[PDB]
Amino acid sequence: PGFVGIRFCQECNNMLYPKEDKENRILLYACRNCDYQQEADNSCIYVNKITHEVDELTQIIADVSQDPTLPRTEDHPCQKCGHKEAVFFQSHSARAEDAMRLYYVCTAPHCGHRWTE
């Protein structure tokens, strides 16, 4: 389903807007401040997840591993590097639909592995 973000006009770094080519029947991108025509390569213009399932795992950051106020368990060894010590916590994201799932970060520098079980 993808997620279409912003694209910028190379000539002035202003936001591009899509426009149908009514002669050759192709999708192009345009700028209101510049006569810059460039060809689209996605064919999708707008998307919106209404249920809005989103991967909290990705927004986890390896730096949380050093948080002193976080619970620690060697009962869940790291899946990547095998280091025993893991910090675990809940999603911490508001708008979480309905969940208490745990997310684990390895307590080893430069491993920085974040995983879910």
CA angle 84, 62, 115 (to 5 degrees): 60
Q: How far is the CB of 24 from Zn ion (least distance, A)?
A: 21
By beta-carbon proximity to Zn ion, the closer residue of 31 and 87 is 31
Verify binding: residue 69, another protein, rule CB under 8 A: yes
Size of the site for Zn ion (CB under 5 A): 15
Q: Which stretch binds another protein (CB under 8 A): 4-12, 31-39, 48-56, 63-71?
A: 63-71
- CA distances from residue 84 to 57, 79, 89, 116, 117 in whole angstroms, order as listed: 20, 9, 16, 15, 15
68 binds, among Zn ion, another protein, none (CB under 5 to 8 A by kind): another protein
Q: What is the DSSP letter of 15?
A: B
89 binds, among Zn ion, another protein, none (CB under 5 to 8 A by kind): another protein
* Surface-to-core class of residue 22, CB atoms within 10 Å of its CB (0-12 exposed, 13-18 middle, 19+ buried): exposed
Verify binding: residue 98, another protein, rule CB under 8 A: no
In 3D space, the residue among 57, 26, 52 whose CA is nearest the CA of residue 39 turns out to be 26
Which parts of this chain interact with another protein (CB under 8 A)?
Answer: 67-69, 89-90, 92
